Amino acid sequence: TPAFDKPKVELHVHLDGAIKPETILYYGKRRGIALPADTPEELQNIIGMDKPLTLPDFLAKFDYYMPAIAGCRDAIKRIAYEFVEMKAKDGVVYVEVRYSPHLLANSKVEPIPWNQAEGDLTPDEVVSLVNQGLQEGERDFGVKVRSILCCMRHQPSWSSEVVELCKKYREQTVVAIDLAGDETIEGSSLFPGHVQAYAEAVKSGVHRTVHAGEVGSANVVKEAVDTLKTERLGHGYHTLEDTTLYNRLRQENMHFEICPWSSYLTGAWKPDTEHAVIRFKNDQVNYSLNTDDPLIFKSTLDTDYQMTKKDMGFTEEEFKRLNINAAKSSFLPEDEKKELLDLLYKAYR
């Protein structure tokens, strides 16, 4: 029994962090890729985490399975398709899924990811394949799906390509640009490559979100809002450390993409303190509930609702409230956004 058995909206979940272990296993053996384990259960046991890990340990989780998907057209399209199915099972009616097109390519991309051999899959084609999988999935599972392309903090050189891809495939699921990766990188938010890609997003009407304040200080949040001119914040928990910034963001109705289960497992949140989502609730902040990386966290969207319901006393009124706000803060055209809202209103009333 779901904690909130009603239609839901999810705005922060990574496609490369939401793959079925069986599918990883299928493609691993299909092209002779070495995987740590040969069974689904032990594979998620290895890939998943039950306790906070060092950043290196965390990032290494990806090294274990991404090589089996990246560079393979069939696989890129398939994980996108299966992703929509997963969300349908979660009772999600609208989802914005994000990922780095570069981390799935083996052609172009100077720093060829995952130590894979030079191939023939460019970031551009990756995007088209994802689009196809997501659209076929929308048709087959009844979930409205849009995507977001991720700039990687440690690779500013890819950021311009990211924004141009968002422009090229606009509406065809791509609705925004994101900035993900290691936030502890000093001045990463200020890297010219990232700043210019976002300045261009503003100029081309590409919506914007940025991972900030998850583990970094309130200062990375401030840089995301004032310099990158982000419209939403991924996590943004450390905004509570700069009261004036927090209050300005509340005044501006800034949207916070919260991932409760994730924040716990990663350690972004210390169990000894009030969870940010609790005060955001008390402060009536504009925020959403999200899984982030279901595969790595061994979770489903219900995991985050069960946690806030049972361990934080969230009411159905708050769940309805936050999903309405998630829809209001979506990067959907105003026309479709209103339709999504009408669905939620009728479903919540």
Task: Rank residues 96 and 292 by Cβ distance to Zn ion and give the closer one.
Answer: 292
- Edge-to-edge strands, sheet with 207-212: 8-14, 92-99, 144-152, 174-180, 207-212, 232-235, 255-258, 286-289
The active-site residue out of 214, 223, 257, 318 is 214
214 is known as an active-site residue: yes
14 annotated as ligand-binding: yes
End-to-end alpha carbon distance in the chain: 21
> What's the closest the beta carbon of residue 235 comes to Zn ion, in angstroms?
7
> What's the closest the beta carbon of residue 174 comes to Zn ion, in angstroms?
17
Residue position matching structure tokens 């509570």? 240
Q: Which residue is nearest to Zn ion (CB)?
A: 292
Task: Rank residues 10 and 292 by Cβ distance to Zn ion and give the closer one.
Answer: 292
Rounded Cα–Cα distance for residues 1 and 43 (Å):
26
194 annotated as ligand-binding: no
235 annotated as ligand-binding: no
> What's the closest the beta carbon of residue 251 comes to Zn ion, in angstroms?
25
304 annotated as ligand-binding: no
Q: How many CA atoms lie within 13 A of 132 on its CB side?
A: 12
293 annotated as ligand-binding: yes
Token representation of residue 150? 């991720």
Interface mask toward Zn ion for 144-163; x: CB under 5 A: --------------------
Size of the site for Zn ion (CB under 5 A): 1
Q: Looking only at residues 254 through 293 of this chain, which bind Zn ion when binding is defined by CB under 5 A?
A: 292
Rounded Cα–Cα distance for residues 73 and 221 (Å):
36
Rounded Cα–Cα distance for residues 342 and 71 (Å):
40
Q: How many CB atoms sit inside 10 A of residue 325's CB?
A: 19
Binding site for Zn ion (CB under 5 A): 292
Binding site: residue ranges?
12, 14, 16, 181, 211, 292-293
Catalytic residues: 214
Binding site for Zn(2+): residue ranges?
12, 14, 211, 292
